[PDB]
Amino acid sequence: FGSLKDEDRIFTNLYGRHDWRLKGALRRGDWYKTKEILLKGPDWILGEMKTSGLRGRGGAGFPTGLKWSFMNKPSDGRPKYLVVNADEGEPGTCKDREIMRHDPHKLVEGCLVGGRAMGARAAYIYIRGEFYNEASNLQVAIREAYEAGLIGKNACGSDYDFDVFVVRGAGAYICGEETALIESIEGKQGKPRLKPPFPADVGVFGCPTTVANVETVAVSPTICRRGGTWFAGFGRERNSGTKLFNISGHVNHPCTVEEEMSVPLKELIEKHAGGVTGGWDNLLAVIPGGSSTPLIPKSVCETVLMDFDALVQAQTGLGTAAVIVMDRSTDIVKAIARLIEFYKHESCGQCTPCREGVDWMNKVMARFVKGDARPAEIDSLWEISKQIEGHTICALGDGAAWPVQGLIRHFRPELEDRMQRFAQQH
Amino acid sequence: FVHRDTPENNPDTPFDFTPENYKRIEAIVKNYPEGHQAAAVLPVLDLAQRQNGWLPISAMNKVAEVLQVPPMRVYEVATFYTMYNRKPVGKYHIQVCTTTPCMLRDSDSILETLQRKLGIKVGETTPDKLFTLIEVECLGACVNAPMVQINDNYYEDLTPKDIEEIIDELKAGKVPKPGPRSGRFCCEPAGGLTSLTEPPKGPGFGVQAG
């Protein structure tokens, strides 16, 4: 439904307004039951995650509990590890920039709460290098915490020993990928690996590893504190909890606000954030989960609850839940065209289908914006699109195909007219 | 992506970490597991850039030696990521975000403003080498859509004029109040908090027993 209470919200420091430093955090009481929780043990913590129903919170929303659980298997003499991706690259995502900058601590105890759940020896946080200032904030926060003894040996009074590190990203969206974050951490080129050697099995430095969206790590301590039920109650069925929503582009007050997941879209922009610029009638389309997810036109925008289940019914992905809105004042053919330009300037090129395919769609898309290309070419891009969708080593090729598919699926008449417009003036 | 040796950009340019920098390099290596120094390539290479913006081929070679990694590896990392200059770069090095979110909120205007403000075209640098204009991609901070990254700072939610003001500040004086030069605080609802209006909660609240 929606309408989460501020009291039941998780990052009270969102929008700042409270010292992102420890003191403000102590008034927040973020480090309240940390020793106790870890004392409970890895299993109990992971269990709470399952009860929570917390899905990914990052890109694909895999059940968090089960995922983390995959490394709750006995150590084989290799130190297990925690990797917390804070790349936050998906266009439209400033979701994570908040927790890191505004509430660094929540993530610090998220790390150790999560750490004992997987029995990780240590956690490395890959904040995108672009955010240099952001990094300045977290290690100040990390430094505070150890000074306190909250982390490190004798973590918060626990025999558990966990060390948290921050790693510099270098302006790559793909670094974000789970197998590629690792390789950047490993120091090689940021090129994803194949899934058959799964991340838990082969870890960073060949030591079991797990990767979580910073939001996913951050909520785990509060969910254990509030209990899985409290959390699980807010969401709809499988889709559960309240996910932060970042609305950017063609909305009166673009902002990141956390609301009950499964909150109707027409409502999200209506209640928080602000009205669609030019009236709700001025809504050509919206991309619910960021650039990777397909945009949905106004057919569903009227009544589509923003929960991953509802979106997959709608053929779109909740993803990072970044709402980008396009008024009737925008050349979508060019809007999506720059996202394909966003992906040609960024895919690693390791795999044949993404390398040439994304460049191929970029060339066709640029011609489509001009209208130089004939109408028959439009359904070809479709066929080029699905060749890329199922054949890619990572998901980015998955992601490049979806916006192209959305433009053809709902805005096929407009592209034909741009086709027609150029043919007429000759 | 080919380094054709040039008198300026080639190893004749000797590179070596200042004593202090080497100390920093050591810590960086400590974070990673022992026996995995190679993992510190990115961090160390960055430090080199901090030392010299150009990050010449010589620098890349030094990084390799310092981390005992094959020279090619350093090259791969440098030529793969984008935050590494691999050429001389302007003192200010402004970068304008032009992904759809920003563009939808009129990013193009900002770029145009800069082009003439700077007098230099994108992909190029000012004669004094004070400013280098680059059309970079999503830099995060999308909510404050109109946004650009001057050097390390993130100037956000900027209207064309604001930048001119900022650029002037950069041109005469320094530290031009880096951040969103708008009424909004960070990424709050511009008009008024849609939530988080009430005071934050307290320790232990609604906590399940133990």
């Binding site: 240099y132 300045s136 290690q139 430094r143 150890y146 490190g152 966990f162 | 390390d152």
Partner: peptide, 22 residues
């Protein structure tokens, strides 16, 4: 306001806290 070495130098300061290596 932060310096170019804030991240690295701060980290070095944290080195002492950093738990022993693997």
């Amino acid at each position: 306001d932060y310096n170019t070495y804030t991240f690295l130098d701060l980290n070095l300061d944290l080195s002492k806290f950093r738990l022993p290596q693997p």
